[PDB]
Amino acid sequence: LNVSKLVSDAKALVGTPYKWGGTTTSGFDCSGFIWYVLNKQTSVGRTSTAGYWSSMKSIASPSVGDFVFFTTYKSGPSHMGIYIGNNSFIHAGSDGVQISSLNNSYWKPRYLGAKRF
């Protein structure tokens, strides 16, 4: 990926509301946000979080532009975001596209690791 573009595109969408199944800037869900941002620079099909966990590349720690994964509403990879540096990531959460921290007491014990596109 063009990392600087990916992170710039993600940052510009912070504040977009949540919408179940949402794939536009009026409202995103977790997978729709990732699909939207990726498709600004490369053609990717609609893909679930588990699909990205299976298809991306394992890494030891995230760098800017990598993808961080979490267990939220079910066991295993069920949520993901874009790592933007400084322990922070952007994700389409249940109350909108937001910046969150890997050091947060909810996200930290739910972190499953990172992958690279």
Coordinates of N, CA, C and O in Angstrom, one line a residue, residues 16 50 60 66 76 89 91 99 103 108:
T16 N -17.0 9.9 10.9 CA -18.1 9.3 10.1 C -18.9 8.4 11.0 O -18.4 7.6 11.8
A50 N -12.5 -11.6 9.2 CA -11.8 -12.9 9.2 C -11.1 -13.1 7.9 O -10.1 -13.8 7.8
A60 N 5.5 -8.9 13.3 CA 5.7 -9.0 14.7 C 5.2 -7.8 15.5 O 4.9 -8.0 16.7
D66 N -0.3 -0.6 8.7 CA -0.6 -2.0 9.0 C -2.0 -2.1 9.6 O -2.6 -1.1 10.0
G76 N -12.0 -14.8 18.4 CA -11.2 -14.7 17.2 C -11.3 -13.4 16.6 O -11.9 -12.4 17.1
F89 N -5.0 3.6 16.5 CA -5.5 3.0 15.3 C -6.9 3.6 15.0 O -7.6 4.1 15.9
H91 N -10.6 2.9 13.3 CA -11.5 1.8 13.0 C -12.9 2.3 13.0 O -13.3 3.3 13.6
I99 N -10.5 7.2 16.4 CA -9.1 6.9 16.8 C -9.2 6.3 18.2 O -9.8 6.9 19.2
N103 N -3.3 0.8 24.1 CA -3.1 0.8 25.5 C -4.4 0.9 26.3 O -4.4 0.8 27.6
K108 N -6.7 -3.4 24.7 CA -5.4 -4.1 24.9 C -5.6 -5.6 25.1 O -5.0 -6.4 24.4

